[PDB]
Amino acid sequence: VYKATRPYLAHCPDCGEGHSCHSPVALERIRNEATDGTLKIQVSLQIGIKTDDSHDWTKLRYMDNHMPADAERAGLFVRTSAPCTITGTMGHFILARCPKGETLTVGFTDSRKISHSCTHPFHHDPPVIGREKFHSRPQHGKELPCSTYVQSTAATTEEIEVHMPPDTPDRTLMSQQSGNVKITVNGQTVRYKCNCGGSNEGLTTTDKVINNCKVDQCHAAVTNHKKWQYNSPLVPRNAELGDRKGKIHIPFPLANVTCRVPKARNPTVTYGKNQVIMLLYPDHPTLLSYRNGEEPNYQEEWVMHKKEVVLTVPTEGLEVTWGNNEPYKYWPQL
Amino acid sequence: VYKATRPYLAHCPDCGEGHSCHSPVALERIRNEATDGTLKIQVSLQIGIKTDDSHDWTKLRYMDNHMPADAERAGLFVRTSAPCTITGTMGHFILARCPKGETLTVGFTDSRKISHSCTHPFHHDPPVIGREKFHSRPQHGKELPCSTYVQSTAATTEEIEVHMPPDTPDRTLMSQQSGNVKITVNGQTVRYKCNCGGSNEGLTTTDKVINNCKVDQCHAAVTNHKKWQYNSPLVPRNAELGDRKGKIHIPFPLANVTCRVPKARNPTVTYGKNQVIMLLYPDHPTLLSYRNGEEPNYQEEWVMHKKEVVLTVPTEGLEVTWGNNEPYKYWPQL
Amino acid sequence: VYKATRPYLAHCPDCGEGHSCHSPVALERIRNEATDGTLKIQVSLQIGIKTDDSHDWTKLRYMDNHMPADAERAGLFVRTSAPCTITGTMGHFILARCPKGETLTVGFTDSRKISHSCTHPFHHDPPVIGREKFHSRPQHGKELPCSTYVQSTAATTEEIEVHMPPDTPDRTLMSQQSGNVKITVNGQTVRYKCNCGGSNEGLTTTDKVINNCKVDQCHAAVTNHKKWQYNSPLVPRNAELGDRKGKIHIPFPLANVTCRVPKARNPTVTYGKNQVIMLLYPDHPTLLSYRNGEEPNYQEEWVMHKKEVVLTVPTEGLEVTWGNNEPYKYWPQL
Amino acid sequence: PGQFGDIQSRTPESKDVYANTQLVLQRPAAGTVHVPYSQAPSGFKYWL
Amino acid sequence: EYKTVIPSPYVKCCGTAECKDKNLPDYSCKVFTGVYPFMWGGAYCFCDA
Structure with a gap:
C-alpha cells in the first residue's frame, strides 16, 4: 500500500x-x-x-x-x-x-x-485495570477483560481516509525572464497563482510563462496527482478535484483481550454486635468496596496505608471486596 | 569470596x-x-x-x-x-x-x-531529615543524627546466606538416540529426571542414556556442587543435600553518621496584647512549630510561601521553632 | 569589554x-x-x-x-x-x-x-500568563502584556559592578632556597602569608625571600591588578585598594513585550429564576470567573473536567468570564 | 501485628526475639519458582 | 523494624514435602501440591503431576 x-x-x-x-x-x-x-x-x-x-x-x-x-x-x-x-x-x-x-x-x-x-x-x-494500582505486569494473576491495540503488522479491520496531496510551496520554481515570470515544472505537477491578468490558474504538468508580471506577485507550490496522502486537517484539500477520496487498512486495531493482575493479603478480622472490624495493611494502593438487601448502599475507598475499618453488617448480609481478592461475605448470628 | x-x-x-x-x-x-x-x-x-x-x-x-x-x-x-x-x-x-x-x-x-x-x-x-525539605546537600549546616550505607568496599559486619545452586533448565542437553533419551553433560553437573523406569535421579558429571524413553518425558537442568549462590527465594533449593548453608560478609553496611541540614532567615517580628505576629519569608519549604504551661497544645505547619502568622502568647509562655533555627521564647509583659 | x-x-x-x-x-x-x-x-x-x-x-x-x-x-x-x-x-x-x-x-x-x-x-x-495553563506557545491568540529578557546580544541598559580580582592560591609561586622560602612573582601581584617572623605581609610586585622558614608554613595567592572581575560576594575583596569599583553593561535586559495566549468552546446555557446554569466541557484547565452592583463578590475557579455551575443572577447583573473568551453578561427579566 | 511490639527483643544483643507479624504464605504462580507472601507492615515504622 | 527470612523453597520433584513445627518467631510453613515449575532451560521437575 x-x-x-x-x-x-x-x-x-x-x-x-x-x-x-x-x-x-x-x-x-x-x-x-x-x-x-x-x-x-x-x-x-x-x-x-x-x-x-x-x-x-x-x-x-x-x-x-x-x-x-x-x-x-x-x-x-x-x-x-x-x-x-x-x-x-x-x-x-x-x-x-x-x-x-x-x-x-x-x-x-x-x-x-x-x-x-x-x-x-x-x-x-x-x-x-482492576482494584490494585500496580507498576509491572505479572505472569500469574486474576484474568480481567481489557482492550489493547494488537502488536501484529497485519492490516485487516481499521482504516483511514486518503486522497491526492495538497501543496508544498517552493519559490525556486519561478524565475525572471527577462522582466516576466517563468515557471519551470521539472517533471512535476505545480499549482500556480499570479497577481496578474490573462492566465493565473492550474495545476500544470508543463512549463508556463506569465508576460509583464513580477516574481513577487506570484505563488508556486508542488502538488502531485501520482501519490496518495492521509486526509489530514493540517494539510489543504486539492482545489481542482472535488470530494475524491480513497481508503487504506491500518495496523494495530483495538481488540478485546485479557489483562493479568495480582492480589493483596487477607486482613486480621474481628467481629462485634451487627458489625465487622478489619485491620488493613496494604503494601500499595488497594481498592476497598462494600455493599448490603433492597438498599445496597455501595461505598468505595482507595486504602493507601494502615487503616482500621468499622463496617455495619445488616441482617440481609454484607459483601466486602479487598483489592483483587474474591469478595468476603458476612452475616449476623441469630 | x-x-x-x-x-x-x-x-x-x-x-x-x-x-x-x-x-x-x-x-x-x-x-x-x-x-x-x-x-x-x-x-x-x-x-x-x-x-x-x-x-x-x-x-x-x-x-x-x-x-x-x-x-x-x-x-x-x-x-x-x-x-x-x-x-x-x-x-x-x-x-x-x-x-x-x-x-x-x-x-x-x-x-x-x-x-x-x-x-x-x-x-x-x-x-x-530535620525540619526543612531541601533538594541539594549543603557543606555547612546543623549537624543532625542520620543513618546511611557506607561507600566503603570492605565487608566486615553485615552478611547473607549462601548455598550450592539449583538448576538452570536446558532442553538442548537431551536428544533422541535413536528412539531413546541421550543426556550429554558437556563438562558440567546436570540434574535429570525422567518419567521412565530404571534410572531417573542425579546429578551427574558424565553422559547418561535412558533406554525406551521419550525426550518429552524427561527434564534436564544445569548441575553444580562446585559453586555457591545466595539463598534466594526466587531459585529452588538443592533437593539432594539437606539444610546445608554457608555465609559471606557483604559491602555497604548501615551505620550512624551525621547529615548537614540548611536553615533560614529570622522573620520580622511585631508584638500585640498577649499575641505575637510573624511575617514569614521562606526560600524553600520550612517547618513552623509552636507550644505553650500544663496544656502545651502542639501545632505544626509546613510554610511554602509568604505567610503572616498570629500566635497567642499565654502568661506561662510560648515557644516557637522556625525551621532549623533555635526555638524562640515569648512571654507577656506584667 | x-x-x-x-x-x-x-x-x-x-x-x-x-x-x-x-x-x-x-x-x-x-x-x-x-x-x-x-x-x-x-x-x-x-x-x-x-x-x-x-x-x-x-x-x-x-x-x-x-x-x-x-x-x-x-x-x-x-x-x-x-x-x-x-x-x-x-x-x-x-x-x-x-x-x-x-x-x-x-x-x-x-x-x-x-x-x-x-x-x-x-x-x-x-x-x-492569562487564564489558561498551556504547554506550547501559539502563533495566534489574545495579546496580553508580559515581560521577558530580550534575545539580543547588545548591552545598553542593565549593568553589573566590577573590580580588580581577589585571590587565586598557587603553591608553585614558592620554592626552597636552600632551606628557606623563595617567592617568585613572575610579573604579577602576589599576596603572601608565612608562619614565621620578620616579614609575612603583602601584596608584592617584586620577588621576596623568607629566611629560616619552611615552604609548608607559607601561603601564596595571585591577586592581579591588570584584570577586572564581577563584584562577587563568593570571592574576597582586594585588601590593598579601598572601595574601588567599576561598572559594565550586561546583555539580555528585562523589557515589556506581548505574550500570545489561547482559548475554548461556549458552554450550553440554561436559565432559571434569578439564576444561570452552565454545562462546562473543558479540553484543558480553564479559568472560570464571575462578579455582580455595589457588592461585586468576585469568585474564581480553575475548571479541569466536566462540571455544572449554578450562578445567582442579581437585578444589577452578572458578568461571567470563561477562559480566554469575552465576558458574558446576564440580567434577570422584569 | 502492625502495632508497637510486633517484634520484641529483651536486650539489643538478644538472640531469640518474639514475633507476631501476620505472615501468611501464598501459592506460587504457575511455572514460577518464588515464595509469595502477605505481611502486616512494620509496627515500629507505624509507631514512628 | 523486623526482617522476613525466606530461604530457597524446597521444590520436591516427584514427591510430597513435609512441614515440621520449628520454634522460630512468626514461623510459617506450607506445602503446595500440583506444582510444575520452570527454569531458563525448561522444567525443573521430571514429573508432570
Missing part, C-alpha cells in the same frame, strides 16, 4: 521551545481507547518503509522539504513527562506505553543529525 | 512491558533503613568482578544462559519514576539516591547489546 | 553529590522577574568569548585553576528537575526556559572531558 502513499509535512504547534513549524513528524491523532493504557499515535511520517517502498523495520521515511528521505528507526522517540516504551511501529502508527503527563512528544533524527519533534497538549493518566 | 560465589538467573515479575522472565538482573531485596534516603539494592548479578574472579570496577558479571559472561559497568542503570544516582556498586549490591516513585528498575547491557531490566513495585518517598 | 574582564572560580555549595567546591561554573544570581517564565542566570564563567578575548558563539571560557581555558558551548547545560531550553548565552549570562523544580543546575565540559556543575536551591514554578 506504501507504493501509492507517501510521508508528508504538516502543521505542528510546538516543534521545540513553543515555536510552530511545518513538521515532518507532525501529530495527527492520539487514540487512548485501550483500557490497558496503550496509546495508538498517528504521525505524518512512515516507519518501517524505505523511499523505494520496500519494508525495513530498521528504517523510517519522512518528507525532507521537497522529496521523501530515509532515517533510522533507533532515533525515533516518544515522550510525555518522561520517555515512553514503544511497543510497535508501522507506517503512520506508533504504539506506546507512557507515564503520567500533560503533553505528548514524538521525534526522530534525519541523516545530517538535526532532531525534529512535535509536542501536542495531551492529558495522559491511564485508569486502573 | 567471588571465587566460590557466582551470578545467577532468577524470577522477575517485569522484564519489560509487564512480562515475566528468568532475569540475569533479578531484584532480590530493596533496603531503605537509611534515614538519608540511600537505597541498598540486592541484585542477581555481580558488579566489579570479572568471570575469572578478578576485581575490576569497570566490569560486571551476569549469568548468560548456561555460563557467566562479562558486561560493562557504565551500562548499569537504576531508575524509579526517573533515573537514580548510583553512589556505590560491589557484587550483588547497589547504593542509589532515587527520586519519588512507585516502582524500582535495575538494568544493564550484555555484549551483543540487548538491554535486560527488572521492575518491582516499590513505594519510594524518603522522609525529611 | 571582555579584554578587561575574565572568568573566575567561586564558591558553590553543590558541585555534585552534595559536596562543596571552588567552581568554574559557580552560580551568582538567578533572576525570575520575567512573567513569561524566562530565567536570567548569572554564572562565574564567560560564554561566547575565547581566551584571546575574541567573540565566538561556539566557544566558552572558564577559569582553569591558575589561567582561563577554552571549552565548547555545545557542552553547556542548564537543568532543574529535568533539562532546560537555553534561549540565549553571552558572557556571565544565560537565558533559559525551565520546567517545575526545587533546584537549579548549570554545567559544562572542559577539554580533557571532566564535567563541572553547580547546584543551588531554587524554587521554580512560573505563574500562568
